[PDB]
Design a protein around this ligand. Sequence first.
Ligand SMILES: O=S(=O)(O)CCNCc1cccc(Br)c1
Length: 658
Amino acid sequence: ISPIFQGGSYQLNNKSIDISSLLLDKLSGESQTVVMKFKADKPNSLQALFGLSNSKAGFKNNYFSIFMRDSGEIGVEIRDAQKGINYLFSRPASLWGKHKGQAVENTLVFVSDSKDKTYTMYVNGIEVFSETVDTFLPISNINGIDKATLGAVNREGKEHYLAKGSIDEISLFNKAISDQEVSTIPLSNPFQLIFQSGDSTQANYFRIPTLYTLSSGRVLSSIDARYGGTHDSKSKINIATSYSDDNGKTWSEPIFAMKFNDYEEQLVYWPRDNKLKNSQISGSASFIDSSIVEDKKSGKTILLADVMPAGIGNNNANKADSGFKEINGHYYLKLKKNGDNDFRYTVRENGVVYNETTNKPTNYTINDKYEVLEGGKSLTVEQYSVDFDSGSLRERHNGKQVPMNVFYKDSLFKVTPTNYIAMTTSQNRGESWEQFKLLPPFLGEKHNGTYLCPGQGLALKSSNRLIFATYTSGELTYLISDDSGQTWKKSSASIPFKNATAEAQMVELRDGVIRTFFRTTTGKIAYMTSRDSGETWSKVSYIDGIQQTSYGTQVSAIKYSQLIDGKEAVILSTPNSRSGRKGGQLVVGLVNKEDDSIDWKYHYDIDLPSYGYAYSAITELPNHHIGVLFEKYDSWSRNELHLSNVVQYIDLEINDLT
Ligand SMILES: O=S(=O)(O)CCNCc1cccc(Br)c1
């Protein structure tokens, strides 16, 4: 299983390199594998790394190419005019540019398999596309191929798609190497994966990463395990967690912190074509947006997430209703029975379902898992599975029964179609999680619930106080517990925005002094300050020197434990761009002890300004390195939906940042 061609140390400086004499006559049979280790830290807008072409006049559309874009997209073209074949396969956000200042060696493996009629592309150990066709075109079998080229494609005698970069190593094989053999090829990745396609979650997609360093030194991560592509609810989403006991070097197989069972956990390849990419799992309950904190006193870890029932709806479901009924100073979860046109039930004390019209209790109770019991017996519903077998999304019963939950479409009793917040705890630092409990309404019976700010909660250094930031229209709403999360109270902090996705994260600058950085609609990150451990909040200011888009992106933030240039330091993680979710940065700010103002002194580029960077999580690791888990793609863009293995983890040292 040896190369028919092997070469390296090619410099692509806007001048193609001819390797036709070396390669062309070696090509034989209809299956080929290309292995290429390359750097491109200053790419042109659109460039080919490798071309096989008919360079003759009139045959400009007869070539094979491996190309990239300065957005980080990778692809191939496979074209033959006489055969009437014009294949283009690609995936956005497939590349690295730079890491710690140095050009990243990307490892690219392209397999053209005539027997399976399939083209498969791997970059950096990640499969980014695998495409089967009815009419297979061997790359070697393009009519009149007479040029093998590095760093351009020769069409009619001219250099198209000129590249800037380098190819440190390239090998070709007259065989389609197995997925197994692919996995044995050495990689030089700057990142690692915590959560990934095919792991225990069986989600093909992940979003909304979090990171938190526990007092034992265990580092914990939570994430949205997203099943129906990368869409926000409506979809099927569970909250998964993983932890590292060796400063981020390795990570446990994920488990669920919050899960529903109404729909099967399926690993699905979500269509990316314009006609089908907006298909959505539409009848599933789900979670979305998790946040983690650790309680010094009990030692427990606490995880909150938004919860959504299957009946949720983007506009008329359900602002102006909390889903609870106030009865004598207390709040009770409302319920609608199959058949009624209003919510004539509540879940009163010990989960007894009461009929509000008659105030009489019923023979139904709700257990700890929000499951329905009749006379003490567990009611069930049939699970759903999804498929695109018929050329469109279908959601159908799969024969399997699962406990009946009030969040489900098929349930006898349903909650209000609105967003809630749930809380779970772990007593073993993320080895297992309790059944979740809904938090009560904070803004009243008739206000819909606030939205959890994903990332971290705040454990104040000097007290037992726990704080989770949430948002709603017109304010941040901080949730405050002084009793290990048994009871919560709110602290409202008005902001000058209506319907902003005001995702907020907090740092403690010094004892009792909290600064909250948050997402806005102004193109600038905002902040407010509290000096009484979250009781009251200042007016809103904005950060200069960092740009976000009009719609903005989540910002992650930590207080670094060590002095930098002799001052207290805060590190922010955000895209730095007014155009899209790209140009990732860690920004180091130094605190001015005179006024608690922050001088944003150091900007570290995570990767190229044009390479994707969206939601993020940062934590100070126990060894004082910085851990970063982040969406490495544009999670807003309608062109970069449903990509696998783009949430990645890196390790950095402060010297890297400065
Ligand atoms: O669009 S993004 O800014 O990439 C992500 C925004 N998610 C906000 C949200 C929170 C809870 C439920 C639902 Br539904 C949406």
